[PDB]
From a paper:
The heterotrimeric Replication protein A (RPA) is the ubiquitous eukaryotic single-stranded DNA (ssDNA) binding protein and participates in nearly all aspects of DNA metabolism, especially DNA damage response. The N-terminal OB domain of the RPA70 subunit (RPA70N) is a major protein-protein interaction element for RPA and binds to more than 20 partner proteins.
HelB is a conserved helicase that is involved in DNA replication initiation, in replication stress responses and in negatively regulating DNA end-resection. In the 1.6 Å structure, residues 496–517 of HelB form a four-turn α helix followed by a β turn and a 310 helix. The hydrophobic residues V500, C504 and F507 of HelB pack against a broad hydrophobic patch formed by RPA70N I83, M97, I95, V93, L87 and M57. The overall binding mode of HelB to RPA70N is similar to that of DNA2. ITC titration results showed that mutation of W517 in HelB to alanine reduced the affinity between HelB peptide and RPA70N from around 4 μM to 16 μM, highlighting the contribution of side-pocket interactions to the overall binding strength.
Residue numbers in the entry:
A (entry chain B): 2 to 6, 496 to 519
B (entry chain A): 1 to 34, 38 to 120
């Protein structure tokens, strides 16, 4: 729960989101 | 009833980016992404839906124990906004409390429409 640990997780969650292209139509952004 | 949800919270996050709100939202759908599974959520505030919610890994037990599941109603207690190069905003949910289970709610509340970025 450190500040830097949270920053790394936020970055990872964002990369996870950006690369999530093979989802069905309701997930298109 | 849409009166149960924080109507306009999604628009406020998308336009103002402020994190000082504790909105009440309904989970519409959850999908895993694969390393631990990372969960992506489609949520409703009764007016709009938005699919760029990401669950912090600390909250994964809520999903794996099925406390956080489609149609449940939850209140967000801490979230982080991250704005991407292209203008989309990702909402990373850090802390939340499930207020009403999926079994108790039973159904999608209202007819929310996708937020048009």
């Amino acid at each position: 729960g450190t500040s830097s640990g949270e920053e790394r997780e936020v970055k990872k969650a964002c990369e996870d989101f950006e690369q999530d292209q093979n989802a069905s139509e309701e997930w298109i952004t | 009833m849409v009166g149960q949800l924080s109507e306009g919270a999604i628009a406020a996050i998308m336009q103002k980016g402020d994190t000082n709100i504790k909105p009440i939202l309904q989970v519409i759908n959850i999908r895993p992404i694969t390393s631990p599974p990372r969960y992506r959520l489609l949520m409703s505030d009764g007016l709009n839906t938005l699919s760029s919610f990401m669950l912090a890994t600390q909250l994964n037990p809520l999903v794996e124990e099925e406390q956080l599941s489609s149609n449940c109603v939850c209140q967000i207690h801490r979230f982080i906004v991250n704005t991407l190069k292209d203008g989309r905003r990702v909402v990373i949910l850090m802390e939340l409390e499930v207020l009403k289970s999926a079994e108790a709610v039973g159904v999608k509340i209202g007819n929310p429409v996708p937020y048009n970025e």
